[PDB]
Ligand binder design. Sequence first.
Ligand SMILES: CC(=O)N[C@H]1[C@H](Oc2ccccc2-c2cc(C(=O)O)cc([N+](=O)[O-])c2)O[C@H](CO)[C@H](O)[C@@H]1O
Ligand SMILES: CC(=O)N[C@H]1[C@H](Oc2ccccc2-c2cc(C(=O)O)cc([N+](=O)[O-])c2)O[C@H](CO)[C@H](O)[C@@H]1O
Length: 152
Amino acid sequence: FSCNVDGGSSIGAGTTSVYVNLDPVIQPGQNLVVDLSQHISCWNDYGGWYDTDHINLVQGSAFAGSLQSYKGSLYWNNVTYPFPLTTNTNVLDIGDKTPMPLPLKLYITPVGVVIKAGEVIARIHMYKIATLGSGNPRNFTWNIISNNSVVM
Ligand SMILES: CC(=O)N[C@H]1[C@H](Oc2ccccc2-c2cc(C(=O)O)cc([N+](=O)[O-])c2)O[C@H](CO)[C@H](O)[C@@H]1O
Ligand SMILES: CC(=O)N[C@H]1[C@H](Oc2ccccc2-c2cc(C(=O)O)cc([N+](=O)[O-])c2)O[C@H](CO)[C@H](O)[C@@H]1O
């Protein structure tokens, strides 16, 4: 099982930064919408749904400390969860060798500068286990970072 970010090097585990582009000005009452499907894609390394991969997001995924007061919802694989995650999410099965954009979006309610360019916004933890043998479990973290400032 592997992923990449913006079509970069392949990632089988560990921590990767994901740089996103945000609306530079938002009004009070407006949320930020971070569509991570535009950035993170994953695939099965055999193809043909051989040794199918089972992927979920993990309880404890959270805002960066500086944004701890913010409110959020996380969309994953057809279901929406409150954020920070207080449960694991549903499982997405991955079996094609062609990269699948992750069905992942973050909606953020800020509670001046809303987001600073270059600062970590959120940390999303992801778990993989496959089907055959031990399933070769792997842990990933996606550290979401803004490319630009957002003001309100
Ligand atoms: C031991 C293991 O992981 N086995 C998995 C297997 O993995 C590969 C199969 C063929 C070619 C490369 C890999 C592979 C690629 C990467 C990477 O590019 O980052 C990292 C690792 N790794 O972490 O060892 C392995 O894929 C199947 C189907 O996806 C299941 O996921 C299995 O469980
Ligand atoms: C389980 C959990 O919620 N928190 C633990 C956290 O787990 C992860 C952290 C990042 C990415 C994936 C996982 C993970 C998710 C699952 C799953 O979704 O079933 C299963 C496993 N697992 O057993 O290897 C790992 O690991 C830390 C230790 O580094 C502590 O143990 C925490 O308590």
